[PDB]
């Protein structure tokens, strides 16, 4: 293996060529923002609930950013479900619903961003990324919309028109792309259970589990978008994630301090 061998294959073979693919796998691995943590703030599970859920999390973000670099992504929530319902009923395809859902995540980022503005924390976009490096350096945090940019090019699910890659996937892929050290999903339950705790009365809490174990237990589509689990098994940089209850005061803070609150889901 060497640079020249890789360049020769890159020139002479299709990118589909297994030999090229394998030489590309041996390339060095640079992490762009290795000291940052990505946090997803759930749309339905947090922001849609208003002040009682959002204000304590704003306070935690403001306290946290003294010792932690944070990229804070927003979910979408009930207005996206309403849009999905209207558009699906008209027969529109998943790529059109994907565009509609992004606007709701953008709304949520704008609302969260306005509560954080006086602390210097911007909503980014516009520039995309490169407002990120300066903001992270100076103010230690930025807010972004969590929906992936695929829009009309969204791959559809096997069945139905709901976009399969939504704001859990968007935030996860940003953590993976930047090589961040940590990915925290902030939801409205303590973590993963053996069943949906809102539907089932005797579900059991799961502190730690791998993707394969989750699949073997029927939990592919539970507290995270199920494609995220497959993205996690493919990831180069973020090989586990943590799901915590944002409605518990201090849970985000304690997760950033290394406490094992919530559920840790591992790629293997």
């Amino acid at each position: 293996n060497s640079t020249a061998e890789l360049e020769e294959l890159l020139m002479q073979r299709s990118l589909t060529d297994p030999q090229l693919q394998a030489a590309a796998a041996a390339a060095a691995d640079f992490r762009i923002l290795p000291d940052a943590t990505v946090i997803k703030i759930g749309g339905q599970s947090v922001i849609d609930r208003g002040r009682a859920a959002v204000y304590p999390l704003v306070d935690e973000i403001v306290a946290a950013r003294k010792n932690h670099k944070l990229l804070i992504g927003t979910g979408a929530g009930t207005r996206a479900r309403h849009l999905y319902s209207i558009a699906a009923g008209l027969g529109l395809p998943a790529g059109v619903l994907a565009q509609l859902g992004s606007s709701v995540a953008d709304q949520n980022a704008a609302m969260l961003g306005q509560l954080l503005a006086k602390h210097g924390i911007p909503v980014v976009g516009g520039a995309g990324l490169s407002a990120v490096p300066l903001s992270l350096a100076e103010v230690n945090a930025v807010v972004f919309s969590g929906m992936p940019p695929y829009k009309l090019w969204m791959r559809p699910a096997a069945e139905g028109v709901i976009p399969p890659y939504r704001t859990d996937a968007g935030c996860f892929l940003l953590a993976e792309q930047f090589g961040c050290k940590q990915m925290i999903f902030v939801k409205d339950e303590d973590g993963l259970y053996t069943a949906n705790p809102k539907t089932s009365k005797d579900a059991t809490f799961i502190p730690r589990i791998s993707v394969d174990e989750m699949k073997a237990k029927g939990l592919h589509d539970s507290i995270l978008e199920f494609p995220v689990l497959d993205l996690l098994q493919s990831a180069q940089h973020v090989r586990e994630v943590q799901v915590v209850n944002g409605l518990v005061p201090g849970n985000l803070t304690r997760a950033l301090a290394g406490e094992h609150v919530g559920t840790i889901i591992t790629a293997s």
């Binding site: 360049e7 060529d17 008209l90 940019p149 829009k151 180069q236």
Partner: protein, 245 residues
């Protein structure tokens, strides 16, 4: 039931970046063929990336960059090929249009003029999927995702080879390479070895909703693109496994 077709009268044509890489010798006849097709079809013409993307992958991988950094770098090269092709067609009223215009205003632009040119790469950008160090969702894949989302009448992939063979017909094993006039995406997906189309194209064909077949044809042979847009069998047909309504 399946989603409606947004632009059922649209024909999508993807031009391989390596066709563009051959320069005037390939581009001038292709432009003359496209010129003659403009009064026959409503065309969305999407360009791939070609060899310059291989160069920026070599530099980017040497610098250690992740797959979400390489994806927009390659997409740039497909946009440049699109600007070149559109310039050659400008006097026919053809211009290059950016990805947001394709996603949101294609109908008005194809009402203004007979064809527009855009980049075939999809805007996955820094949210490209991990796993390979080479961006998987490239020009074949983006063009198909678009054509199928629109419910277009067809997608034709215009390459520098006659179609798909059992081995790379420009590669080491080219002596045992046999031409395949027809295949299914599911059979290709189970094969190993290189293809003239993205492997992710076969995955998005499995979830497709409208387009039943995609033809790969040699753009270096005048007349093949014209024949393919009339449904004539002149390259390799790929069956997507959409089944009729």
């Amino acid at each position: 039931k399946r989603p409606i077709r947004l632009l059922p009268w649209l024909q999508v044509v993807k031009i391989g970046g390596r066709v563009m890489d051959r320069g005037a010798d390939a581009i001038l006849p292709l432009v003359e063929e496209l010129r003659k097709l403009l009064p026959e079809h409503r065309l969305l013409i999407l360009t791939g990336a070609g060899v310059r993307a291989r160069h920026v992958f070599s530099v980017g991988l040497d610098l250690g960059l992740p797959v979400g950094s390489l994806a927009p770098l390659a997409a740039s090269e497909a946009g440049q090929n699109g600007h070149i092709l559109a310039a050659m067609l400008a006097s026919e009223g053809v211009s290059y249009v950016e990805h947001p215009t394709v996603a949101d205003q294609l109908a008005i632009h194809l009402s203004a003029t007979r064809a527009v040119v855009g980049s075939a790469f999809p805007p996955y950008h820094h949210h490209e999927f991990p796993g390979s160090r080479i961006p998987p969702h490239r020009a074949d894949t983006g063009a198909f995702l678009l054509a199928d989302a629109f419910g277009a009448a067809g997608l034709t992939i215009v390459e520098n080879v006659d179609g798909i063979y059992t081995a790379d017909p420009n590669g080491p094993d080219r002596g045992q390479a046999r031409f395949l006039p027809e295949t299914s995406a599911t059979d290709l997906a189970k094969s190993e070895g290189p293809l003239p189309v993205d492997r992710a194209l076969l995955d998005v064909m499995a979830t497709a909703r409208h387009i039943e077949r995609v033809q790969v044809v040699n753009g270096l042979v005048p007349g093949r693109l014209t024949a393919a847009l009339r449904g004539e069998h002149v390259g390799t047909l790929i069956r997507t496994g959409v089944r009729p309504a």
